Design a protein around this motif. Structure first.
Motif: not given
Ligand SMILES: [Ca+2]
Length: 125
Positions: A12-21
């Motif tokens: 998640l973190v590696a895919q920039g998913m934290n705070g995405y939208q």
């Protein structure tokens, strides 16, 4: 593969998913737990002939192509079979498209029913 919650969190973190939208990690993890139990091979056949594939249960009528679903749009431009392997990179990149068009986690019926308004302390990264 049945991922461990911390492998899921690293991806998640590696895919920039934290705070995405403005979607926090515990929300993404709770979603994946209730959708698939972290199973990268999870599948669900629906009444309209579509199937939900993988860890985030991505649907073959709108997002991926399985070659047997009526009215397929293939919006992620990906074979659904790529959502049943052990690398969730492409799965996560498709989920960003889904969540970005809905502006939130409303496409996932398990998030709404089992995560929205419930405690997420069991799902922290
Ligand atoms: Ca994959």
């Amino acid at each position: 593969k049945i991922l461990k919650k911390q492998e899921l969190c690293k991806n998640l973190v590696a895919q920039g998913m934290n705070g995405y939208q403005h979607i926090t990690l515990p929300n993404w993890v709770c979603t994946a737990f209730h959708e698939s139990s972290y199973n990268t091979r999870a599948t669900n056949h629906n009444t309209d002939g579509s199937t939900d594939y993988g860890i985030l249960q991505i649907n073959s009528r709108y997002w991926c192509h399985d070659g047997k679903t009526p009215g397929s749009k293939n919006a992620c431009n990906i074979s659904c079979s790529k959502l049943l392997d052990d690398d969730i990179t492409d799965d996560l990149k498709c989920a960003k498209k889904i969540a970005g068009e809905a502006k939130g986690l409303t496409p996932w019926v398990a998030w709404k029913s089992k995560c929205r308004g419930h405690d997420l302390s069991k799902f922290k990264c």
